[PDB]
Design an enzyme around this catalytic site. Structure first.
Site, mmCIF file in Angstrom:
data_model
loop_
_atom_site.group_PDB
_atom_site.id
_atom_site.type_symbol
_atom_site.label_atom_id
_atom_site.label_comp_id
_atom_site.label_asym_id
_atom_site.label_seq_id
_atom_site.Cartn_x
_atom_site.Cartn_y
_atom_site.Cartn_z
ATOM 1 N N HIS A 70 0.804 -1.015 0.005
ATOM 2 C CA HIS A 70 0.000 -0.022 0.055
ATOM 3 C C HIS A 70 0.797 1.330 0.024
ATOM 4 O O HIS A 70 1.683 1.471 0.675
ATOM 5 C CB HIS A 70 -0.970 -0.100 1.081
ATOM 6 C CG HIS A 70 -1.910 -0.911 1.182
ATOM 7 N ND1 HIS A 70 -2.103 -1.949 2.148
ATOM 8 C CD2 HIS A 70 -2.979 -1.468 -0.019
ATOM 9 C CE1 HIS A 70 -3.041 -3.110 1.707
ATOM 10 N NE2 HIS A 70 -3.516 -2.614 0.563
ATOM 11 N N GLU B 215 1.241 -4.805 11.202
ATOM 12 C CA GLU B 215 1.047 -3.058 11.000
ATOM 13 C C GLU B 215 1.703 -2.467 11.932
ATOM 14 O O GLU B 215 1.697 -2.614 13.403
ATOM 15 C CB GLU B 215 -0.501 -3.233 11.438
ATOM 16 C CG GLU B 215 -1.502 -4.122 10.606
ATOM 17 C CD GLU B 215 -2.192 -3.268 9.475
ATOM 18 O OE1 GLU B 215 -1.299 -2.505 8.879
ATOM 19 O OE2 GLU B 215 -3.053 -3.438 9.148
HETATM 20 N N1 LIG Z 1 -4.110 -9.495 4.670
HETATM 21 C C1 LIG Z 1 -4.790 -9.660 6.156
HETATM 22 C C2 LIG Z 1 -4.735 -8.229 7.019
HETATM 23 C C3 LIG Z 1 -4.532 -7.170 6.034
HETATM 24 C C4 LIG Z 1 -4.577 -5.602 6.973
HETATM 25 C C5 LIG Z 1 -4.357 -4.657 5.918
HETATM 26 N N2 LIG Z 1 -4.123 -3.384 6.640
HETATM 27 S S1 LIG Z 1 -3.670 -2.169 5.951
HETATM 28 O O1 LIG Z 1 -4.494 -1.751 4.644
HETATM 29 O O2 LIG Z 1 -2.130 -2.183 5.743
HETATM 30 N N3 LIG Z 1 -3.892 -0.834 6.852
HETATM 31 C C6 LIG Z 1 -4.920 -0.483 7.560
HETATM 32 C C7 LIG Z 1 -4.728 0.339 8.815
HETATM 33 C C8 LIG Z 1 -6.090 0.795 9.421
HETATM 34 C C9 LIG Z 1 -6.413 -0.559 10.256
HETATM 35 C C10 LIG Z 1 -7.687 -0.007 11.287
HETATM 36 C C11 LIG Z 1 -7.430 1.086 12.059
HETATM 37 C C12 LIG Z 1 -7.103 2.431 11.468
HETATM 38 C C13 LIG Z 1 -5.626 1.892 10.731
HETATM 39 C C14 LIG Z 1 -5.955 0.349 6.599
HETATM 40 O O3 LIG Z 1 -5.652 1.331 5.850
HETATM 41 N N4 LIG Z 1 -7.081 -0.257 6.674
HETATM 42 C C15 LIG Z 1 -8.405 0.337 6.049
HETATM 43 C C16 LIG Z 1 -9.613 -0.267 6.617
HETATM 44 C C17 LIG Z 1 -10.757 0.168 5.793
HETATM 45 C C18 LIG Z 1 -10.871 -0.198 4.243
HETATM 46 C C19 LIG Z 1 -9.509 0.483 3.615
HETATM 47 C C20 LIG Z 1 -9.777 2.118 3.764
HETATM 48 C C21 LIG Z 1 -9.836 2.262 5.318
HETATM 49 C C22 LIG Z 1 -10.996 1.682 6.046
HETATM 50 C C23 LIG Z 1 -8.358 2.070 6.203
HETATM 51 C C24 LIG Z 1 -8.457 -0.037 4.448
HETATM 52 C C25 LIG Z 1 -5.288 -4.483 4.794
HETATM 53 O O4 LIG Z 1 -6.431 -4.031 5.337
HETATM 54 O O5 LIG Z 1 -5.146 -5.018 3.552
HETATM 55 ZN ZN LIG Z 2 -1.195 -2.000 3.954
#
Ligand SMILES: NCCCC[C@H](NS(=O)(=O)N[C@@H](CC1CCCCC1)C(=O)N[C@]12C[C@H]3C[C@H](C[C@H](C3)C1)C2)C(=O)O
Ligand SMILES: [Zn+2]
Ligand SMILES: [Zn+2]
Ligand SMILES: [Zn+2]
Length: 305
Positions: free
Chosen positions: A64, A266
């Site tokens: 990302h 994370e």
């Molecule tokens: N593969 C298994 C794990 C994948 C975990 C991964 N997390 S991430 O994308 O790197 N980062 C996370 C960090 C956040 C997590 C919750 C608290 C606030 C921060 C992230 O951006 N999530 C969202 C969550 C929704 C949908 C979309 C846009 C917004 C709302 C932020 C992505 C991933 O969703 O792909």
């Molecule tokens: Zn990510």
């Protein structure tokens, strides 16, 4: 003008992949595993002392675009490998016995866009039919419970799953690489931000993995190791249970290929700065994260399969 304690643009990271390899030819080799939508080379660093029939750990950063601390970490990891090989017992053993395939920036096109146009960009930069909305979430584009609840069918959405599993050149390149080296790869690590969480499968459905107890225990221990440095608190668990449904992720895909040690990290922080983590925190974030990564590496080494 590369610095491990600053965020570096793609041109700088790219030149660094070349220079770090040329300076360390007995510890690092570099390949391009594919190209991005816009035609950028996707580089992969093989870090380890060459040897026959070595097992490997795969780690990606920058799936990302806006998660700048992730890109910074892959560079930090390689920094630590070259700096401490021959000087510290554990890293020395690691690089002798294992290879690390480090992919410093998967989503290069997106990363460039966060430097030029939109700091908060997440997805790839590929076009979508029938709309001017751009990009697919690579972490909803792998062929594991692909495009179910937790991913979006709307191309204008941040979790858009793409037109098909592996539709994105970047996703296909990574998956193709792991498929081509599956018999050697023993663990899969994916670096993200933010929220201070270690996730393991599954995220594509509410289900626990066959080795749930082992992964729970390993995550707990890695989180403990990480806290020893600065007292930074991480939480952990299966993705769908701790975080949210997020189908089509590289970690779940790798796990279902048989790579039984599969984790998503994370990194800092817990929302004060969020994705815009200050450069002054790169050092501490990376140093504490190193402890968790080394803990997992040492475990994998003691549990080859
Ligand atoms: N593969 C298994 C794990 C994948 C975990 C991964 N997390 S991430 O994308 O790197 N980062 C996370 C960090 C956040 C997590 C919750 C608290 C606030 C921060 C992230 O951006 N999530 C969202 C969550 C929704 C949908 C979309 C846009 C917004 C709302 C932020 C992505 C991933 O969703 O792909
Ligand atoms: Zn990510
Ligand atoms: Zn260090
Ligand atoms: Zn054991």
């Amino acid at each position: 003008g590369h610095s491990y304690e600053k965020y570096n643009n793609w041109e700088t990271i790219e030149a660094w992949t070349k220079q770090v390899t040329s300076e360390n030819p007995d510890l690092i080799s570099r390949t391009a595993i594919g190209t991005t939508f816009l035609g950028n080379n996707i580089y992969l660093l093989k870090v380890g002392k060459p040897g026959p029939n070595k097992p490997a750990i795969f780690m990606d950063c920058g799936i990302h675009a806006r998660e700048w601390i992730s890109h910074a970490f892959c560079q930090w990891f390689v920094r630590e490998a070259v700096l401490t090989y021959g000087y510290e017992s554990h890293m020395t053993e690691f690089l002798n016995k294992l290879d690390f395939y480090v992919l410093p920036v998967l989503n290069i096109d997106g990363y460039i866009y966060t430097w030029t146009k939109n700091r908060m960009w997440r997805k790839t930069r590929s076009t979508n039919a029938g709309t001017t909305c751009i990009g697919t979430d690579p972490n909803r584009n792998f062929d594991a419970g692909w495009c179910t609840t937790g991913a979006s069918t709307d191309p204008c959405d941040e979790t858009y799953c793409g037109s098909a599993a592996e539709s994105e050149k970047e996703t296909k390149a990574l998956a193709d690489f792991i498929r081509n080296n599956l018999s050697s790869i023993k663990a899969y690590l994916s670096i993200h931000s933010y929220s201070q969480h270690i996730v393991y499968p599954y995220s594509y459905d509410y289900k626990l993995p066959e080795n749930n107890a082992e992964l729970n225990n390993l995550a707990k221990a890695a989180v403990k190791e990480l806290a020893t440095l600065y007292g930074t608190k991480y939480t952990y668990g299966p993705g769908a249970t701790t975080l949210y449904l997020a189908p089509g992720g590289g970690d779940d895909w790798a796990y279902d290929q048989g790579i039984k040690y599969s984790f998503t990290f994370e990194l800092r922080d817990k929302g004060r700065y969020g994705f815009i983590l200050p450069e002054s925190q790169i050092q501490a974030t990376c140093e504490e994260t190193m402890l968790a990564i080394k803990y997992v590496t040492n475990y994998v080494l003691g549990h080859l399969y």
